[PDB]
Structures are given as C-alpha cells and as structure tokens.
Amino acid sequence: SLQEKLLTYYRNRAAIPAGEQARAKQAAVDICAELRSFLRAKLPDMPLRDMYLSGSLYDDLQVVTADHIQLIVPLVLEQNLWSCIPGEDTIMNVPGFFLVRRENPEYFPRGSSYWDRCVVGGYLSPKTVADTFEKVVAGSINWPAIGSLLDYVIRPAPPPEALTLEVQYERDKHLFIDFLPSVTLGDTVLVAKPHRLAQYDNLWRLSLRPAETARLRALDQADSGCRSLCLKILKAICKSTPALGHLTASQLTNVILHLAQEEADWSPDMLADRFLQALRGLISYLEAGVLPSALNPKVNLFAELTPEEIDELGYTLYCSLSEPEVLLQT
C-alpha cells in the first residue's frame, strides 16, 4: 500500500540517524563559540545578545542528513532609536519585508548608536549589516587554523551564499551553517540575508520559521497527529529529487498548514490520504503562481520562484499523480 510505502520511506530515507545529528550539533556549537571569541576580541563595541543555533535540526524536522544549521546573531537595537515599516506600507510594496528607520536623529545624534555606522539615507541597511558579517565568513576569521584545531574542514560556501559556511564534520558528511543577523523591534523579528534580486536584498526579511513551526507543533500536540510526519516525508522527497529541490521547507510547511485548516483528521492511518492531498494542493498553488503564507496571508511564498521553475515543478508533480510511489525513489 502507499500507506506502508510512505512509512517505510520515512524510516529508511527521511529519518536522520542519531549519530550524525549529534555530531553536526557539536560542530555548530564549536563554530558559534569560535565566532563568540572573535567578536569579543575584535568587535567589542558591537551590541549582541548571546548567539544561538537554530532551525530544523533543533526541532526534529530535518531530513535525510544533518546538513543545515542557522546561527542566529541577535543584534541589539535601542528600542527608542529605530522603528520598522512593513514593506506593503512603503513604496517598495513588498509584503514580508520591512524597512528599519533611524528615529530621534537630532535628539540622539549620529553616533549615539553603534548601528549608525550601517545607516544609509536614514535607514538601517540590511546590506551594510550583512556585509559586516560576510567579512567574517569570507575570512577575517582564520577557518583553516580553526579547522585543524577542531578536526573539521571549514570553508565559505560557493557564491551566492555569502553568509554561509561549509563544515565537513565527519568523513563523508557536511553541514552548511547560515549566519543570520537578526534585529527585534517590539514583537517583530527581522533578518538580514543577501538576496538574488535587489528588490528583496534592500529590505529586512520577516522571520517566518519560528511561528510556522510553532503552529505545526501545537496542532500535532493536541491530537498526536501526523502533520509533521507528512511534512518530513515531503521535505525528504524534495531533498532527494532534483526538480523538486526548488521547493522550500517553508513552502511545504505552508502547504501542510493550509491542509490542516481544511482537514481535522490527521490520525496515523490518514497519512496516505493527506500526502496525496498535499501533492494536489501544491499543484493548485503552482498553477495559480501564489502560495499564501498561512500565518501572513499577504505574503506569496512563491514570489521568488521564476515562472519556468514554477511550470517545471507543476509538470513533475502532474507526472507523479498516477503512481505517487515513484516520488519515493532516490
């Protein structure tokens, strides 16, 4: 049955062995500690809360192999000196992105904040804040020496991933660590990440992952449902299948959250049914060219995909509907 094929696939392909996940997490802590030391010694004036490791490896959502960690760099902004503006209220008109503006510029003149060095025309530039950390990934830190010292091979990821480090942590296993400079203004948390395409690159991105995955975890906690299990299977398919790799975890997670709004029953025996509904739902969003965020409905999660990527994704999924088991090949 598709049901038993999906559970087999989960067990043998999607689930990451415990050993690699433990070893990857050590590598991340060591890198984070090396970065802590470097910033203490070289950028002591820069105000930061404690950096910490985040993402799907920390909330049991990573699949296939332990290869991706987010290192959150929480910058501290003075709450009276900075405000944020939702992109849809700016002339850029970009939902899910924000400008950050310097406030009280006369009363607290230029220099009253460290972050005044990153201001461009009165706004806190995510490009200038990212560039300050891109200098670290690209190598103001001596990663060869650190790597010899830790027994890892550490190097910058290839372009355009300028805030990402590749870390070979065991023979034959690698990890990508993304350094995410983050600011928090009231209850809004924003991240600077370089983007391919100026429209997004110029603005701070609203962090969506923690709220999306908290919704999913709450839904499953209440009924021990299979929503996460269905998500992980979809992630492992996309990770394992070259055409489908252009789908993101955030996109797949919102497909599942939209389905959880329509279907109350996610008991273990509904996995097969829900898996097929997810495929069909992805097809429908791809044909419309819009996947609204379940948490922020103005944001189109397909906005950054090109139209040919969208057409070719839709085709691959249409080809799989008659025999969905083929998506479980690796």
Curated annotation (Swiss-Prot):
Subunit comment: Homodimer. Interacts with DNM1L.
Role noted for this protein: Mitochondrial outer membrane protein which regulates mitochondrial fission/fusion dynamics. Promotes the recruitment and association of the fission mediator dynamin-related protein 1 (DNM1L) to the mitochondrial surface independently of the mitochondrial fission FIS1 and MFF proteins. Regulates DNM1L GTPase activity and DNM1L oligomerization. Binds ADP and can also bind GDP, although with lower affinity. Does not bind CDP, UDP, ATP, AMP or GTP. Inhibits DNM1L GTPase activity in the absence of bound ADP.
UniProt-reported outcome of changing Y107N: In OPA14; uncertain significance; loss of function in positive regulation of mitochondrial fusion; no effect on mitochondrial localization; no effect on homodimerization
Lineage, opening ranks: Eukaryota, Metazoa, Chordata, Craniata, Vertebrata
Protein name per its UniProtKB record: Mitochondrial dynamics protein MIEF1
MF GO annotations: ADP binding; GDP binding; identical protein binding
Consequence recorded when altering K235E: Abolishes nucleotide-binding, but not DNM1L recruitment
Domain of life: Eukaryota
Region (Important for interaction with DNM1L): 27-36, 101-109
Main location: mitochondrion
Residues the record lists as binding ADP: S54, S56, H68, S207, R209, K235
